[PDB]
């Protein structure tokens, strides 16, 4: 048996923060804390009453300023208005375009969306709370845990050994540039599933020449969680 | 030889929390709820003095009735060349401004009735009668907490949780609906909470630091015996092991 | 036997602020 055991820590596959991008009051939270959410799923409703009225109101200002700029374009061509009058009508119209766009944007942000598919934890913000565009604290955190990472730090010579043995053919291929691996948990138990150990360096230490690589394991139940000390098993 | 009982320390926590905040400027005319009592979602908790908001809304409706009549009349007249497009456009502009002014005065006026976002128990009012309130102010006026199903947060090493999850699918733990184990509760004074709830295995937070997980039990709390912040023990029954070596 | 003694602090039953709702002297 050339049956090697590499120590590692689980970490999330992908992390994203949920932040408000307009001021207002939280009307609804909308997800169950500790649950699965999809990329683009709506997690919060910010009270949209006034955002909705501003947008409607900006739309109505546009339609009217638009009609004036167009009528005045016809009219300067017959010298029924001066060039200044037309310029002023055109400027007011263009200001209106800009104001509708900005109101549309604010109003879209009242639906606060998940940046990624994954698991969401606790809401840091309650219903009825006030939020502010640019505030310091995230409202929540989504973590893709299903494919999960392990994170294996070994000396570069170790990485050489393993890297050559894959090409030589001593290690079985999990795919392109990775070896099949298995996982043993903190309590000695065997994780049923089996992953790839990918040979890409993620970081190389300052002092030590030691390299972190990552295994990827399936995690469709939610058995593995970040921060677990484990051992990848290579044969 | 041995009974297998797992005991899990946690704290009680509200099932749901909502803050109550003003969305218009003015003065608190009335408080309207008793401090520490049960409120309903949508119940009026405060009256912000509506006088001016009432008068702005009426006046905007009046201005709307009149700019609307005028915009419509001028629409007919411009068709017969009794007025210019400029005259009709001015009239239509004013009519649209009245629409916008009505909608805004309606919203401000609706917010003078400050409502409970959820059903639950309200504690103290942090703002008094006659206080000033501002849209966007930093501090909430009050807090409602749903307490009846109450949570117990249980923290533990994630491999211990995995171990318990095994015992669930194995049958060694008694199930309480989907993905949950049956649990009972031990209070700080050592007594037995008479009710029992579910220990949900879905993780609510993790610490990558010390590699911990927090999960939650849910207990019924219909007589408000439990209140957030209590130190408690969640008790899991894992059955007896006959011949046992320690 | 005896009385239990629980330490407390007195507080107003009801509190209100007095504020002007119009500009002037």
DSSP string, B180-210: EEEEEEE-TTSPEEEEEEEEEEEEEEE-SSS
Q: And the tokens for B42?
A: 């949508």
Q: Is the dihedral of CA A143, A148, A151, A157 positive or negative?
A: negative
Nearest Cβ partner of A128 from B89, B117, B205? B117
Contact B202 A222 (CB under 8 A): yes
Q: And the tokens for B108?
A: 């401000």
Instruction: Say how far apart CA B215 and CA B227 lie, in whole Å.
Output: 18
Contact B128 C17 (CB under 8 A): yes
Are the C-beta atoms of C13 and B129 separated by less than 8 Å?
Answer: no
CATH class in words for A49-108: mainly alpha
Q: Which helix (H) or strand (E) holds B102?
A: helix B85-110
**What is the number of alpha carbons within 13 Å of residue B209 lying toward its C-beta?**
4
Name the residue among A160, A194, A191, A192 with its Cα closest to residue A180: A194
Place of tokens 């700080």: B188
CATH class in words for B51-110: mainly alpha
CA distance A198 to chain B (A): 22
Q: Where in chain B is the domain with CATH 1.10.287.470?
A: 51-110
Q: And the tokens for B54?
A: 């009432």
Fold of B1-15+147-242: Elongation Factor Tu (Ef-tu); domain 3 (2.40.30)
As a residue count, chain C comes to: 25
How far is CA B52 from each of CA A204, B103, B115, B130, rounded to the nearest angstrom?
67, 16, 20, 16
Instruction: Say how far apart CA B246 and CA B98 lie, in whole Å.
Output: 83
DSSP state of A13: S
Are the C-beta atoms of A20 and A139 separated by less than 8 Å?
Answer: yes
Residue of B nearest to C17 (CA): B130
Q: Give the list of residues 6+ apart from residue A169 with CB closer than 8 angstroms, or none.
A: none
Residue A82 CA, distance from chain mean position: 53
Q: How far apart are the first and last CA of chain A?
A: 7
Using CB atoms and an 8 Å cut-off, which of residues 183-222 of chain A contact chain B?
185-187, 222
How far is CA B101 from each of CA A62, A64, A94, B22, B74, rounded to the nearest angstrom?
16, 16, 22, 21, 21
Interface present between B and A (3 or more CB pairs within 8 Å):
yes
In this structure, whether the domain defined by B16-50+111-146 belongs to CATH 3.60.21.10 is answered with: no
In this structure, whether the domain defined by A1-13+145-235 belongs to CATH 2.40.30.170 is answered with: yes
Q: Where in chain B is the domain with CATH 2.40.50.100?
A: 16-50+111-146
Place of tokens 């010579």: A157
Instruction: Say how far apart CA B68 and CA B72 lie, in whole Å.
Output: 6
To one decimal place, what's the resolution in Å? 2.4
Interface present between C and A (3 or more CB pairs within 8 Å):
no
Contact B140 A128 (CB under 8 A): yes
Are the C-beta atoms of B154 and B234 separated by less than 8 Å?
Answer: yes
- Cross-strand pairs, A46: A26
Contact B131 C21 (CB under 8 A): no
Instruction: Say how far apart CA A11 and CA A217 lie, in whole Å.
Output: 11
Instruction: Say how far apart CA B215 and CA B179 lie, in whole Å.
Output: 12
Q: What are phi and psi of B223, to 5 degrees?
A: -110, 20
Fold of A14-48+109-144: OB fold (Dihydrolipoamide Acetyltransferase, E2P) (2.40.50)
Identify the three-state secondary structure at position B134.
coil
Residue of B nearest to A58 (CA): B100
Q: After which residues is chain A broken (C to N over 2.5 A)?
A: none
Name the residue among A162, A216, A177 with its Cα closest to residue A193: A216
On chain A, the residues whose CB falls within 8 A of the CB of B136 are 23, 130
Q: Where in chain A is the domain with CATH 2.40.30.170?
A: 1-13+145-235
Contact A57 B100 (CB under 8 A): yes
Instruction: Say how far apart CA A182 and CA A147 lie, in whole Å.
Output: 14
In the structure, how many helices (H) and strands (E) does chain C have? 0, 0
CA dihedral B162, B165, B170, B176 (to 10 degrees): 170
């Amino acid at each position: 048996t050339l049956n090697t055991e590499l120590p590692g820590r689980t970490n999330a596959f992908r992390i994203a923060e949920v932040r408000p991008q307009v001021n207002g009051i939280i009307l609804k939270r909308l997800f169950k804390e500790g649950s699965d959410v999809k990329a683009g799923q709506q997690l919060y409703q910010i009270d949209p009453a006034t955002y909705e009225a501003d947008y409607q109101s900006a739309q109505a200002n546009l339609a009217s300023t638009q009609e004036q700029a167009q009528r005045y374009k016809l009219l300067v061509a017959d010298q029924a208005v001066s060039k200044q009058q037309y310029a002023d009508a055109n400027a007011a119209y263009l200001q209106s375009k800009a104001a509708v766009e900005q109101a549309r944007i604010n109003l879209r942000y009242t639906k606060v969306l998940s940046p990624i598919s994954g698991r969401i934890g606790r809401s840091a913000v309650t219903e009825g709370a006030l939020v502010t565009n640019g505030q310091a604290n995230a409202m929540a955190t989504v973590q893709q845990l299903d494919p999960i990472y392990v994170d294996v730090t070994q000396p570069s010579t170790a990485l050489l050994r393993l890297r050559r043995e894959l090409a030589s053919g001593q290690l079985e291929r999990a795919g392109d540039n990775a070896a099949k691996v298995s996982l043993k948990l903190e309590d000695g138990s065997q994780y049923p599933l089996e992953g790839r150990l990918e040979f890409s360096e993620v970081s190389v230490d300052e002092g030590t020449g030691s390299v972190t690589i990552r295994a990827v394991f399936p995690n469709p139940n939610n058995e593995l969680l970040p921060g677990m000390f484990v051992h990848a098993q290579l044969q």
